[model samples]
Target chain A: EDDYTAYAPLTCYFTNSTLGLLAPPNCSVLCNSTTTWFNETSPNNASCLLTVDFLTQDAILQENQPYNCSVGHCDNGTCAGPPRHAQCW
Target chain B: EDDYTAYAPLTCYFTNSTLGLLAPPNCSVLCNSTTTWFNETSPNNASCLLTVDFLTQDAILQENQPYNCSVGHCDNGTCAGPPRHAQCW
Candidate 1:
């Protein structure tokens, strides 16, 4: 809607609990927030269709390294699939 | 120091290796990046004294959750200490 309050802070969160995530043995996935991808519409107003990816812990568990997930382009906040993390649940 | 090119993207990274951190079993710590804290100086220029904190995996391992660390007042890119992760190394 017009109000971006629910979407502010724009960080990733697990919104679904009905599915079992195929994650690492002792680790789960987290989607990092996407900013700077937004197109500034005003001083405090901007818009972006964020497509957050599920984080992978492949080498993170083995070498104590954090993985960076590539967040694909959102095409002006219009592209839609799942609005947030779908895998790595 | 005038050019922020080296600090672009503003992501967190481990810059020290001489110290051993006291971390949790089977888990290490990571620091999240701080943005939006920068004050607008121009269309493409802003500044902030980012004081990032080491992320704690407190109940993350037990409950598979991610923790958020608060970045305290930076007072306009002047606060100085370790610039990156100091604990959970």
Candidate 2:
């Protein structure tokens, strides 16, 4: 089996019009009640970023087929799949 | 009483090290299990942006005390408090 982990961040940006409808739904109540600038020129649009961690534990196991096992049951409990594979071995 | 609404988006940026610990608790499990690049140079650190909408339903009801009412109960259902006030009228 292989053992390795990976981590990374994800970010998303949007325009003002697009941002008006992306609120997680639940956040609407609070934001609607505590925000000031909400007009067209307001900061209604911006960016959203998040971090993620991955792992790969079985490099030699399954002939280097990490994803075949589970999701990220390979690298150091980090849960990262193999880089590239031609076919299932 | 007055009526108005507001909307906007919020973006947050962070460094690589900071992104490692910002993923929502639930996202950790999935991200850690299904991601590939997780190393130092990985995309782990990026940007996050989201939009929000605010609403206010009264502008002249409380004589211009929007925030004093609720949160965003002024400016066209946008929920905006007064700009600057010394004391209640």
Candidate 3:
């Protein structure tokens, strides 16, 4: 609330599994990602391509860095919705 | 180089592809890509850029997105190799 940490584990990067933010946008419709240069091809030579990497200062799947989430905030772990049991995993 | 405009039409999203900025990174060996939430399927559904949509607010695949390209600066039209012609395509 005032301190931006009133609730326990209510950090940045939180979204509602309740909302399925991590479930991806337009899912079941577009149901997926928009495709970048990285996946420009199918079965992409399995050998040649560019890459986009989202990383923390030290891990692969990290959360709670502060305001990284656009939909919600970071919880004890992943993105969530409604601040309840609605998780992205 | 001084006004970032001395070369004319030099905007963002420019890569030499003179250096092959368009060429997938790590190519030739890992041979590419660090992978991300988008290309995890290895033959992705061909439906996603978050469907990031590199656009000009009116179109997609737009150049001059401003700092969109990390390697080179925008050019007369597209990214260039060492400011010459290293285009990724």
Candidate 4:
């Protein structure tokens, strides 16, 4: 006999503490908004993007890939308002 | 009369010092190999991926997008050997 089963997918969680106190001002709400992303996309989703968003963690958000930030996006953890400066986390 | 000119594209350079001394042992040669990446891809290309490689800095290499790493790829600055572990820089 054999006993085998796939491990349940891991769920990645986010919180204000994730970024610590240095996270930008706008990241507060997002960190507490019960937002969720796949564990597969960790640090990317954890990125603090802009005034009201983080880089799209899941395509389900319809924003863009985690690697391509839209206008008013972020670079690493710093928010940038410039067009060309916007980059995926 | 009018005078106009576009700014020359900026060049982003990578070096052994980029990752500091803690960079993996294999990263030494790559950091010193004079390898170059587009300035637009800055930090992503600066990442130290794995043995003899940084994540694909340019599509010209035909490996894959800088965001998606393949076999023996890296996560952040650390290398991973597991399949599911493979991820974009």
True contacts kept of each: 0.00, 0.01, 0.00, 0.00
Give the Å error, residue A62, model 3. Answer: 25
Off by over 4 Å in 3: A1-16, A20-85, B1-84
Candidate 3 displacement at residue A68 in angstroms: 20
lDDT winner, 2 or 4: 4
DockQ of 3: 0.01
Candidate 2 vs candidate 4, DockQ winner: 2
Better of 2 and 3 by DockQ: 2
| lDDT value, residue A1 of candidate 1 | 12
Give lDDT tens digits, candidate 2, residues A1-89. Answer: 11112223333222122112222211121221122322211122212111111244533433333122111112221323332221111
Error of 1 at B74 (Å): 28
Q: Rank by lDDT, descending?
A: 4, 1, 3, 2
Q: Would you list the clashing residue pairs of candidate 4?
A: B67-B88
DockQ of each: 0.02, 0.03, 0.01, 0.02
- State the displacement of the C-alpha of residue A74, model 2, in Å, after optimal TM-score superposition: 39
In model 3, how large is the Cα lDDT of residue B2?
17
Deviation in angstroms for B59 in model 3? Answer: 24
Please, what are the lDDT tens digits per residue for candidate 3 over residues B1-89? 11211111101111222233232221111121122212122121111111121335543234323213233333322323342222221
Candidate 1 lDDT, B35-84, residue by residue in tens: 33322222112212233242443433322321222111223233323334
Runs in model 4 lying further than 4 Å from the true structure? A1-4, A12-49, A52-71, A83-89, B1-89
